[PDB]
């Protein structure tokens, strides 16, 4: 469930896999993973 619209662009161009220390979770898929598409949600249906 990635971001939909970015706020600001990024300027630095640097290899990121060598810098995985600074980040908290870090996931790299190869090319067009079929997982980032399906969207499930929870719902509340009427209140009495």
């Amino acid at each position: 469930r990635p971001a939909i619209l970015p706020s600001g662009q990024i300027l630095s161009n640097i290899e990121v896999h060598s810098h995985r220390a600074l980040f908290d979770i870090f996931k790299r898929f190869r090319s067009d993973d079929n997982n980032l598409y399906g969207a499930e949600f929870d719902a509340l249906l009427g209140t009495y």
């Binding site: 161009n13 640097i14 290899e15 990121v16």
Partner: protein, 50 residues
């Protein structure tokens, strides 16, 4: 740049290209030398001098 009496470009392609990608730079070549040394040779009696 002007060198000798000639005009020539000057560019390092480490920033525009190859930046943050896994392929190494090609211009950093590799020299090669093969050393040699004698182990247990013995000089004659004419050169044992301090």
């Amino acid at each position: 740049v002007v060198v000798g009496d000639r005009l020539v470009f000057l560019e390092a392609l480490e920033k525009r290209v190859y930046q943050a990608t896994q392929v190494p730079y090609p211009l950093v070549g590799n020299l090669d030398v093969t050393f040699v040394m004698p182990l247990g040779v013995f000089k004659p009696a004419a050169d044992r001098y301090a």
